[PDB]
Homo-oligomer: 114 residues x 5
């Protein structure tokens, strides 16, 4: 598996507008909400669950990086894997997307896979 | 269990106004005080205790997040489970609330569970 | 044991003015000096030692919190237990006070035991 | 093995201008892009992969240090070992350079091997 | 052993002017260069190496503290133990000094052993 696998989904030129931290089923988790920097389109919501899924090892790295980009409001590419989380109220509150990477976008194309 | 369980309580548009770090019964812990951004109501106090209660796994995550929101002073939604800490002197100084989640807020909506 | 126990001592309306980190007998340690925010009184010196005393479990949390309040310079209540450290040269450089808690203070109250 | 081995390459007076975090083959990784502060030259891309290559042990230290220099914009020397990563889409997105060191730079020299 | 043992050396009223992070013999390490705050004297160079030397337990504490003092530029006392690192190329690039403590300094004094 790889953040960059074409079977994942990415959204370029976004900003992290909201951040949530909590716990589910004995695992820490966080979710972010992102929107296009220019206000077009619809938000993206993705979560990381520290104990769950193949992406679990990257939980702390992703949380630290989400926190930094959330604090700066700089443009980013968000990378997700769709349809991972299953608890109905959780998915309804947030989404089923697992967060699988974050790329800065300070230049013409974001610094990450496409 | 989940931060968003309906048996938990939450308080929207709160500012984390105070922070305390200490130790009880072998466990580092922290507590925060929060107040409505609009100044109404009565303060909320909630604590997390390392290796104690079902919420123990998220102790570090919540401490780091409380520190961040405390430093910015932004309005957040605080999620707690009532009646978790039972040490009476501790409860009298702070509260029995376990902190179980923190959500950032726009002017109109906080990013976390509700209802 | 508890930070708020009557057998501990506290000092309110203090600012953390100095910070030191070192190692003693295989254990990292740190010390802080605090002075009354209004200039009165005698300074307070306390240390935490990562592998020593009943307060060992809270070393990293107090180190992080001391660093935070040291960087902001804000008014705090410092909680100590006296007569803990025993190495005479260490005590004479710093003190025998173990650091057992840190509470933020507003103008006329602090958020912690008293 | 050492950051300063003659078999590694380095680039001075560079500024970290992009940062990416993700995961590949169960391993967290990050990549950075640096460009000459004076605008000359070709960008340098390098990645660290938490449990791959002989440089795996320094992943967290270099991630944290990359974050710091990225946030200040200061001029640094970046040390890499060439031709390490092999997954083609990863290498073509980023590069094959492993990140093996970061050194602050002054006007005339930098603080590290050369 | 203690940071404050008379057999260690210290240098007062210094500023951390350079920071380097790398890896050697499976260990992430960092070195710092410090100079007198008033601009006089000759620079000091010290390193801390993960999992190496009796000072290994304090590696992360010293790294975090060095980064903070480096970021502020404030006056500090640096404590070292001479003749610890033996790799000649490493010593020739940096030095044999192990970093063993860091103390904040006021205009008046430094908060640490002397």
């Amino acid at each position: 598996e790889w953040t960059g696998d074409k079977t994942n989904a990415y959204y370029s030129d976004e900003v992290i507008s909201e951040l949530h931290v909590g716990q589910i089923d004995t695992s820490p988790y966080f979710c972010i909400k992102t929107v296009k920097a220019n206000g077009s389109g619809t938000p993206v919501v993705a979560c990381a669950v520290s104990k769950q899924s193949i992406w679990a090892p990257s939980f702390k790295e992703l949380l630290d990086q989400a926190r930094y980009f959330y604090s700066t409001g700089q443009s980013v590419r968000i990378h997700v894997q769709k349809n991972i989380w299953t608890y109905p109220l959780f998915v309804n509150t947030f989404s089923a997307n697992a967060l699988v990477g974050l790329s800065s976008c300070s230049a013409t194309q974001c610094f990450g896979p496409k």
